[PDB]
Amino acid sequence: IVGGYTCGANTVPYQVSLNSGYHFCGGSLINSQWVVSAAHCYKSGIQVRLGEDNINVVEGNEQFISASKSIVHPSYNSNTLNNDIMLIKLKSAASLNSRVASISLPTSCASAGTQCLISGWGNTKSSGTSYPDVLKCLKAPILSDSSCKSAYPGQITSNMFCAGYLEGGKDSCQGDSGGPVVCSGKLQGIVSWGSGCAQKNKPGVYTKVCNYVSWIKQTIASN
Ligand SMILES: Cc1[nH]c2ccccc2c1CCN
């Protein structure tokens, strides 16, 4: 997260870190057994880390649970990033509490102008590289479909939306991949892609979660 703020320990209780020897992506806890992330975060050997603030220190609220199964969306295209969503099932159920909690799925899509919270352990620099230990947060509005398409000609599908600031300076970044965009207490987006980070006229692009609720629910119901 570039241009954000320190969230505060465990204030984003649905935020997970995906770990394969190191943090490599975010995700969102959606029930005691399932996490939603980006398809571009797929790899084998994932341990889901819940209850994290400092990802380099065991602070006492963590739960570390290995994945038993990952399901990349059937229509994910890794060249265009269309349908950039994946589900991860935990080998055991997380113990839910005030600091480890699921985030509700949307019942309706969110409109341009809606304020959202984007979070993660990604790079905090738009030029150069610095990776934080503690969770970073950014409040950002959803941008209009027309401004999103104008920013990224030929690339924005109906499964994507932009959020952030056309002036630059505030954005998600590398390592925030797969993490949440939460608006009014609902998971509306997944950190998906963009041209650099925090660049003028290049806002972040996010998977449009509301399009996937039926797939998420039916997948959970049979897996
Ligand atoms: C999700 C993601 N991962 C990256 C890796 C390198 C540069 C930009 C990005 C982005 C977009 C950030 N808005």
Ligand SMILES: [Ca+2]
């Ligand atoms: Ca920790």
